[PDB]
Design a protein around this ligand. Structure first.
Ligand SMILES: *[C@@H]1O[C@H](CO)[C@@H](O[C@@H]2O[C@H](CO)[C@@H](O)[C@H](O)[C@H]2NC(C)=O)[C@H](O)[C@H]1NC(C)=O
Ligand SMILES: *[C@@H]1O[C@H](CO)[C@@H](O[C@@H]2O[C@H](CO)[C@@H](O)[C@H](O)[C@H]2NC(C)=O)[C@H](O)[C@H]1NC(C)=O
Ligand SMILES: *[C@@H]1O[C@H](CO)[C@@H](O[C@@H]2O[C@H](CO)[C@@H](O)[C@H](O)[C@H]2NC(C)=O)[C@H](O)[C@H]1NC(C)=O
Ligand SMILES: *[C@@H]1O[C@H](CO)[C@@H](O[C@@H]2O[C@H](CO)[C@@H](O)[C@H](O)[C@H]2NC(C)=O)[C@H](O)[C@H]1NC(C)=O
Ligand SMILES: *[C@@H]1O[C@H](CO)[C@@H](O)[C@H](O)[C@H]1NC(C)=O
Ligand SMILES: *[C@@H]1O[C@H](CO)[C@@H](O)[C@H](O)[C@H]1NC(C)=O
Ligand SMILES: *[C@@H]1O[C@H](CO)[C@@H](O)[C@H](O)[C@H]1NC(C)=O
Lengths: 441, 295, 441, 284
């Protein structure tokens, strides 16, 4: 039944009720979409060289007995996703000392899968994907301390009311390259919770390259307390996109925009990249980013930003890249980008910018790339770009440029003189021909 | 693999729109948690409700606009059969569901309805509030005026109440005989000392007598619960329990949103399982291997 | 000294202290920017065929004596503007029975100029321009009832606290083609005024082609009471641009947007054109235009419109043209334009439109011209323009079109099939080439 | 460069005219906001909302003043007399009279409508709970107190005695109508607010604490509090708000008028060079 080509046995959707006889040299087996009701020790007897095994989405109810994968010491990746009501016996992963990657997405697993001994045999485990299960409380068993190569955990879509110090005790001492806690909600961890003190620091003595906390709401008062609680945690790259509770949003003042205290807990984290896009932020308040003293990249794209207060960027001494694309900016002036002395890249595309102030880019001498495309600019002030002597690339297209002389004189000469900087080509509204081609008498 | 690819696009289109809806529901939920647990003026509840209304409307707009190749993926319970196999047996069915404000149980969902009147809330949102509390010391019934705190008998023509100079007992006598020392005016503490039991209050508000319970939390006019309502401009008015029910704040707002949430989540899970199905059917046709690194 | 060419004597800025000897056949004389201190009967003795006379901006203080223009029976246009502290004797315009146009802009005139007999001789007067003077109260003298050809009056820039029935008694019976009461403020005529009853109807028994009330604030409550006051007045064309008090503006709720009562007084006015641009309107509320049943053209350009409520255009059965250009619309759906069945022209350019609903133009079968340029559209829904069979012109340029196939297929095919309709040329964002040129496989 | 400079003279004048109009509209809106603040029924929260809009309009004025330019020249930034040469032969100069016009120069720095106001007794009882105390009166040597709220008349003594109808002798109870019948002279009031006795002049006009004039500070969220003149100084709401805006308005209007006269001057200078006739129809 299976298609065996080279080292690969594709046994997808073949009406199998058991593991078939396969050539014993295969190193890759896909047994997805069959009706295997139960795996046990006899299932994979033949297949020693096996490195990659997928047994995804069997008919609901798959049972994996003790010692099913015993003797599969070459197995590196095991995918058991979408097995609805997966039943694992506690020694189900015996023999898997060499396994690096285990995925169990949407298998109706609860927190006992972490607190029990199911993963005790997986001493070489690197990567564990437990998305979209019924894990309500993250409580790794003590053997996790001895898993020296464990560095990726994906818990996306589990409904986790809270994560606390005592929950994550057995992750202390770990460095995670990726800890993905996205759309878990953390519903309990709000400002009216009586649990904050007892919760302590869930990431005590833990460090993280990428901490993905996207899709969790992060109301300002939650973000402040959560970052107060994990203060000191080394995080290189912070992802808080779709913090749908964070901004006040345009038109309402029920929730607060983040302010100069919101991210104080990240003072000592060493954050290099921060993603705050799609979070309904409407105003950048003074000093809101002041604790991000190592920050090099900041995206605030696709928020609702209409207002940037003076000193909104105070403290961002290392900031190289600022993305404000897809926001609601109506105009720019010099105060908006004060304190961004090292900035190299500014994306202001897809706003509603109708005017640039005389000295809009004054405090951006190192700007290399400036994106002003897709706004609503009829004109720029004379000399606007003169101080930008490190500029390499500018975007100006998809704006209704008014090519009247002399209004257009400075920009057309500027674009003509700097033609290799222009990305795309700004057009006159009306005639539709290049701004750079206009010559004013 | 063409139809299986379309199956994927439909499933991605629906998943994206469900996520938008989920985020709006979760924001509505947090707004509601704020309305319930925050200290919230009348004006704050209206602002919150204005935002909730706008989010509910964003849900209906997503429901109404989201489409892939003609198909309005959230508009109707529709079982889409996608043929995944050359030989004509392999169909995979996408289970599409009507998801909009009405179907999620959220029509009329609100958080700024009228609240049951309380003694505290009366004396916090009205003026010229007169009346008294009743105390009972066994057989004897007493009235304690509010604002003055004066202790009087609970009769048609009420007598002033004083405190016995020797005993501490309650009495209507101005003084006591000797062998006259004045009795001091009675106070709440004198009824408390004397073991009196708090009964019902009679609270007059804009010239209308209301009966409050001992604890002061339930107010009734002719045996019907009273609710305080406020105009846009901010004038407090007292209404009955039946004219209240129409404009009521939604009972169990959290449970209503969670219901909506789990209904949105169930379609989301289903879509995830169905995309894994499509992914496998494409890899089965191409005979494609994923690589260890790419994994 | 003067330049005489043809029938025209140009005697501008020649250091003249009197009217020079001119050839007697000239019919046009310009004596502006001289130092003529005084005109009298001997000034224009020579010049019978004179039709057009300008004596603007002499050195301050010009005196015009009795009978200055007597014998100038061919004079049609007399321009005396910018004579600071102009002194007219009361018979200054004797002999001018044939004069059609008199202009006295910025001459420091007060209301006595209208209530005295200065204009009594001007029996043929059509047009009187009294801009930028110190007329505080408009009180035409009784002889105005006998001026059968008088039909234009411009009072722009006079600070007029109020206009009332008794002020304008002597314009009753008149039909004005143009009554320009622009930037007069009408400061007293607000909602706290004790004067409304006594004010009555300033336009009683008067009708107007163009009533220009631009630049006067017109807070919503003022508009309502003013139009209540003048209820019944036939007005063909109503100009309320720069009613800087009318809208709530974006971000604030101190002032009200106009509502279903605001323009009730115009029920029976027969208004055909209404200009409400530059008035800070933020929301179009339901039935706000419902009393404009004869309305043919409506401009709401350069407001702050971000929200159009259901049935905002209810009652506009005759509306042919709607201008919503330079506003803040973020999206369009079918409910926005209900009740506009006769609409032929819709201008939505220069908004911030990021999305068109499936059926945005459903209730607009008769549309001939559609302007969507200068917005922020990445795409349109399939079939969006299909029911627009009367369409002659469409503007789509200066939008960030996404030329991905197949997202772009419908629009590129539509544009290619309908290319003579497209005004300007929609471009792909990215490549910058024409949308019409994309062919999807 | 004869009609060339005159044309530039026109452009400068139009650029300034347009900017002045933007500023005039903002001032007139600020004026109407201020009229609403004064004559409307306005909660504490309303006055704050009004002021937030006023601040934004004042800020729009400074922006216009700072950005408006024609060919390098910031037409509203500095008092500057621009000579434009309008005649070939070098004598014809027409001078544009440009003026510094911004929030500071219009006298509107700190213009506000929500700041603390001098405290009145009316305003005390209208904004505080448990406002107690009495007015004083005097019919010659005899001295009286009248309790606000209750209207009871007592003797102005250390340990005070009830007064009756004027006698302390046990006769109906004394009230203010009996005092004015005795031609009594209203003296200073003594008013306790949140447990602090303040003193008020006869008319309720001024309120003092140890000689210091008291102001009522108002927050958006309804709570009010009392503060002294010195602490109110920098933030107190603007005296004569209408007069302040009207002052700004007529300053802006005077530049506008002048510009109108200077544009007419330029128009004539151009027609004088071209030898241009306007036509009867074109005049209509
Ligand atoms: C967990 O805690 C330990 C002990 O405090 C950390 O190890 C120390 O780290 C410092 C640098 O900050 C070194 O100078 C010491 O030499 C280390 N101690 C020991 C005993 O080696 C450890 O790095 C923490 N782990 C994480 C992941 O944060
Ligand atoms: C600023 O952020 C925007 C929005 O997130 C970026 O655009 C996205 O970039 C990714 C990765 O290249 C694309 O797959 C998406 O399609 C883009 N989304 C949209 C809505 O365009 C943008 O590139 C960022 N700007 C810069 C200069 O990096
Ligand atoms: C001003 O008043 C008169 C009299 O009321 C108007 O004249 C009448 O107009 C109606 C048409 O609506 C005719 O049927 C009557 O015969 C007219 N009466 C007379 C005596 O002529 C007149 O037209 C009004 N003028 C304006 C400008 O409204
Ligand atoms: C909608 O109104 C806008 C704004 O008034 C019109 O654009 C103006 O048209 C006038 C008169 O032709 C021009 O002199 C202005 O320069 C235009 N202003 C701007 C800001 O572009 C527009 O033409 C109207 N739309 C239609 C379809 O008539
Ligand atoms: C292994 O699986 C098969 C099911 O096909 C079953 O018959 C057998 O008893 C199982 N063996 C053990 C040891 O559980
Ligand atoms: C499987 O393995 C564990 C560990 O030895 C053992 O204790 C357990 O009872 C076994 N379960 C079954 C069902 O055989
Ligand atoms: C000008 O004319 C009128 C009418 O004859 C006369 O009464 C008036 O006073 C005259 N003015 C002078 C200055 O003579």
């Amino acid at each position: 039944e299976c298609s065996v080509i080279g080292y690969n046995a594709i046994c997808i959707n073949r009406g199998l009720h058991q593991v078939p006889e396969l050539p014993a040299h295969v190193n890759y087996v896909d047994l997805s979409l069959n009706s295997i009701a139960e795996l046990n020790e006899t299932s994979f007897s033949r297949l020693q060289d096996l490195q990659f095994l997928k047994v995804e989405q069997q008919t609901p109810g798959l049972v994996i007995r003790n010692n099913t994968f015993r003797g599969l010491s070459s197995l590196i990746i095991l995918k058991l996703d979408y097995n609805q009501f997966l039943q694992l016996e506690t020694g189900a992963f015996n023999g898997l000392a060499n396994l690096e990657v285990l995925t169990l997405t949407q298998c109706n697993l609860d927190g006992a899968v972490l607190s029990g001994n199911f993963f005790k045999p997986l001493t070489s485990l690197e990567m564990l994907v437990l998305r979209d299960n019924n894990i309500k409380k993250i409580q790794p068993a003590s053997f996790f301390l001895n898993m020296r190569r464990f560095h990726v955990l994906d818990l996306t879509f589990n409904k986790v009311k809270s994560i606390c110090e005592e929950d994550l005790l057995n992750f202390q001492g770990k460095h995670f390259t990726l800890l993905r806690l996205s759309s878990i909600t953390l519903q309990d961890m709000n400002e009216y919770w009586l649990g904050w003190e007892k919760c302590g620091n869930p990431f005590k003595n833990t460090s993280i390259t990428t901490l993905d906390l996207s899709g969790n709401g992060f109301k300002e008062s939650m973000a402040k307390r959560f970052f107060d609680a994990i203060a000191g945690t080394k995080i290189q790259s912070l992802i808080l996109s779709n913090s749908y509770n964070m901004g006040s949003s345009f038109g309402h003042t029920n929730f607060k925009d983040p302010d100069n205290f919101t991210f104080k807990g990240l003072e000592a984290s060493g954050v290099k990249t921060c993603d705050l896009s799609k979070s309904k932020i409407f105003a950048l308040l003074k000093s809101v980013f002041s604790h991000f003293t190592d920050l090099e990249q900041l995206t605030l794209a696709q928020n609702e930003i209409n207002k940037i207060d003076d000193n909104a960027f105070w403290g961002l001494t290392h900031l190289l890249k600022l993305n404000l694309s897809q926001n609601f900016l109506g105009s720019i002036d010099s105060r908006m980008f004060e304190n961004l002395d090292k900035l190299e890249v500014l994306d202001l595309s897809y706003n509603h910018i109708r005017a640039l102030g005389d000295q809009s880019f004054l405090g951006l001498p190192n700007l290399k790339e400036l994106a002003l495309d897709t706004n609503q600019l009829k004109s720029v002030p004379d000399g606007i770009f003169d101080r930008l002597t490190s500029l390499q690339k500018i975007w100006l297209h998809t704006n209704p440029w008014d090519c009247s002389c002399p209004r257009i004189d400075y920009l057309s000469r500027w674009l003509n003189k700097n033609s290799q900087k222009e990305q795309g080509s700004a057009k006159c509204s009306g005639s539709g021909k290049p701004v750079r081609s206009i010559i004013c008498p | 693999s063409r139809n299986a690819n379309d199956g994927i696009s439909i499933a991605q289109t629906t998943e994206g729109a469900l996520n938008e809806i989920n985020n709006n529901l979760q924001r509505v939920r947090e707004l509601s948690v704020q309305a319930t647990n925050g200290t919230n003026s009348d004006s704050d509840l209206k602002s919150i409700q204005d935002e909730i209304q706008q989010r509910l409307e964003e849900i209906d707009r997503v429901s109404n606009q989201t489409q892939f190749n003609g198909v309005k993926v959230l508009s109707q319970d529709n079982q889409m059969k996608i043929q995944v196999g050359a030989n004509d047996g392999e169909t995979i069915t996408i289970d599409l569901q009507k998801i909009d404000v009405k179907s999620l149980g959220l029509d009329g969902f609100n958080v700024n309805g009228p609240k049951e009147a309380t003694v505290g809330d009366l004396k916090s949102s009205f003026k010229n509030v007169t009346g008294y509390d009743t105390y009972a010391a066994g057989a004897d019934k007493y009235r304690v005026d509010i604002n003055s705190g004066a202790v009087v008998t609970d009769a048609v023509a009420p007598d002033k109440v004083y405190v016995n100079a020797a005993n501490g007992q309650l009495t209507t006598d101005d003084a006591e005989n000797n062998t006259k020392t004045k009795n001091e005016s009675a106070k709440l503490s004198d009824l408390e000392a004397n073991n009196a039991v708090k009964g019902e209050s009679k609270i007059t508000v804009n010239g209308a007598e209301y009966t409050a319970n001992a604890t002061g939390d339930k107010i009734t006019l002719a045996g019907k619960t009273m609710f305080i309502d406020k105009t846009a401009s901010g004038v407090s008015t007292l209404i009955n329990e039946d004219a209240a029910a129409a404009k009521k704040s939604t009972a169990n707002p959290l449970a209503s949103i969670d219901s909506a949430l789990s209904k949105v989540d169930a379609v989301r899970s289903s879509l995830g399982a169905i995309q894994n199905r499509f992914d496998s059917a494409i890899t089965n046709l191409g005979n494609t291997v994923t690589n260890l690194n790419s994994a």
